[PDB]
């Protein structure tokens, strides 16, 4: 009945599309024709399972169905567990190339040759390069993908039209996927309670006129959606998403006023829209938290009776008043309150003991404020590229044991905060910045974890989800790192740099910059700025040569 249930709830195309995503993410190293085959042949099966409900095997338990269809060490394995085998071997940075789209004519030709297979392939491709991509947003991006070819492919300049559309699509996906990766990490490494806490903070910021009870609703159901989704149960995930949008669009009256337009849309666009909506205006006059959370004779009695809800309401009340705080900051405040109550409700005079909690929050607020402010001042003076260069040095000097690819990827991403967030008024900056940073640090953590080389990084990735950013920013330079010996090769460049995009070309320059810092970690600062200027110059020199480009050898 379950596989009928889902087909009935989702529709052919969505059902179809998601199961293909499912397999991709389970089985990353297997071809498109395999994957497609077993999707139709579970889809033939489903179609029957609807019409008479009770066919021999329509009984079966969803994993079981997909688990059986894949095989044709994990297929030897027994159940409630064989499934766990899959999401285990689900790994981050795959063992796969870059897509590097072939050509606009090549594609539109293929696009026409099969509208469907083509579009079915995009899903497959993204699906398999990010195995935690949030399935239901993927469908959304697909419709955006299909729309772009269904517009530009007829034009005289297919290229001037299609590319800009596709590139903002690529970027939108990378953002979406990392974002999801952090939700899966929170759940899977720090547990449900943490995620729930995150969700109370975000939803309270975003739905501040909602009562707590409606926020419990959203969080409990949001948490299922992500539990299931992160756990590969993509249909039940996708349908629960639909249900929650259903519940949200029916009780707008009592969540937010900013939803009518979202809630006037087709399914795929609806959730996505809702997921991204402006925080609502908070209610006009909100009492201070003092009464409930410090002055009441009953703080400890209330806390003892139901700690997590008590802290929950605390987090709800703080957050709904503080759209300007990042989510992680908020969680640190709740954590602070919590450890104060755990200390103070033991005391002879609890009240005395916690009278001054609110004072503890100030330095905790100040700290991210001050930091972002510095980094934005720096970005302002440097531009994106040199700002990334500054971070590379900083991070490489902090954790030089981390691999070079990783440091480049992560530092470039940290640098993109400044373009993202310094733009805004210092008042929307913190949520924008600190929450993007979280996501980037997460990427670092998950990459690092597959080959732990640095105890400092492991430690920061592990002690505390919400303090990762402060923890990493607190790292001083690793003055005990032994510099690796020199390879005059990693610091030569070859003629093919010339023919690469500025960005790829940048990635080389930054790769060399990191390598140099590892080799001479002590000598630094102006030198390092001056090194990039030279790099970014005998390139733009050697390439203008038209002198057999051997010139690069002749700077070696």
């Amino acid at each position: 009945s379950e596989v009928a249930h889902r087909f009935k709830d989702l529709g052919e195309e969505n059902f179809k599309a998601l199961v293909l995503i499912a397999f991709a993410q389970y089985l990353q190293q297997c071809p498109f024709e395999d994957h497609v085959k077993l999707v139709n042949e579970v889809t033939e099966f489903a179609k029957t399972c609807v019409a008479d409900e009770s066919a021999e095997n329509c009984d079966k338990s969803l994993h079981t169905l997909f688990g059986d269809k894949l095989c044709t060490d994990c297929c030897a394995k027994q159940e409630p567990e064989r499934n766990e085998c899959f999401l285990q071997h689900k790994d981050d940075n795959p063992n796969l190339p870059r897509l590097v789209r072939p050509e606009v004519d090549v594609m539109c030709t293929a696009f026409h040759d099969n509208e469907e297979t083509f579009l079915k392939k995009y899903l497959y491709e993204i699906a398999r390069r990010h195995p935690y991509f949030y399935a239901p947003e993927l469908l959304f991006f697909a419709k955006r993908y299909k729309a772009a070819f269904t517009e530009c492919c007829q034009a005289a300049d297919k290229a001037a039209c299609l590319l800009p559309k596709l590139d903002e699509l690529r970027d939108e996906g990378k953002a979406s996927s990392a974002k999801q990766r952090l939700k899966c990490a929170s759940l899977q490494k720090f547990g449900e309670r943490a995620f729930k806490a995150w969700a109370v903070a975000r939803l309270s910021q975003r739905f501040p006129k909602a009562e707590f009870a409606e926020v419990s609703k959203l969080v409990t159901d949001l948490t299922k959606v992500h539990t299931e989704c992160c756990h590969g149960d993509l249909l039940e995930c996708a349908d629960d998403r639909a249900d929650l949008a259903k519940y949200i669009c029916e009780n707008q009256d009592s969540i937010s006023s900013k939803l009518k337009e979202c809630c006037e849309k087709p399914l795929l666009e609806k959730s996505h829209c809702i997921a991204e909506v402006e925080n609502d205006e908070m209610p006009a006059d909100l009492p201070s938290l003092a009464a409930d959370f410090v002055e009441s004779k009953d703080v400890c009695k209330n806390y003892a009776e139901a700690k997590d809800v008590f802290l929950g309401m605390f987090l709800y009340e703080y957050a709904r008043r503080h759209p300007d705080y990042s989510v992680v900051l908020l969680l640190r405040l709740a954590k602070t309150y919590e450890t104060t109550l755990e200390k103070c409700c033991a005391a002879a005079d609890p009240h005395e003991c916690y009278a001054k909690v609110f004072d503890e929050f100030k330095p905790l607020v100040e700290e991210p404020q001050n930091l972002i402010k510095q980094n934005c001042e720096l970005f302002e003076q440097l531009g994106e590229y040199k700002f990334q260069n500054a971070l590379l040095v900083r991070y490489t000097k902090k954790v030089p044991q981390v691999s070079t690819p990783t440091l480049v990827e992560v530092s470039r991403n940290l640098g993109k905060v400044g373009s993202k967030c310094c733009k805004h008024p210092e008042a929307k900056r913190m949520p924008c910045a600190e929450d993007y940073l979280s996501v980037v640090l997460n990427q670092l953590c998950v990459l690092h974890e597959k080959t732990p080389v640095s105890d400092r990084v492991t430690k920061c990735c592990t002690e505390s989800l919400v303090n990762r950013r402060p923890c990493f920013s607190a790292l001083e330079v690793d003055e005990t790192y032994v510099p690796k010996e020199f390879n005059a090769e990693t610091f030569t460049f070859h003629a093919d740099i010339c023919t690469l995009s500025e960005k790829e070309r940048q990635i080389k320059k930054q790769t060399a910059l990191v390598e140099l810092v590892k080799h001479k970690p002590k000598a630094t600062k102006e030198q390092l700025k001056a090194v990039m200027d030279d790099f970014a110059a005998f390139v733009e020199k050697c390439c203008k040569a038209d002198d057999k480009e051997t010139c690069f050898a002749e700077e070696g």
Binding site: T220, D221, N302, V309
Partner: protein
């Protein structure tokens, strides 16, 4: 229609349920009472029950 009647009825009742589990504070009963939607009464009530044990 009238889900208000159900709303009224779910609040009364959740509160009895909580009371039966030994929750004793209006802080929580007030919150149930602020609810606005039956689904939320339910989720809030269950989170309290989970939180108490």
């Amino acid at each position: 229609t009238i889900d208000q009647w159900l709303l009224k009825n779910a609040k009364e009742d959740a509160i009895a349920e909580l009371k039966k589990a030994g929750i004793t504070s209006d802080f929580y009963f007030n919150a149930i009472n602020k609810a606005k939607t039956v689904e939320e009464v339910n989720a809030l009530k269950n989170e309290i029950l989970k939180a108490h044990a």
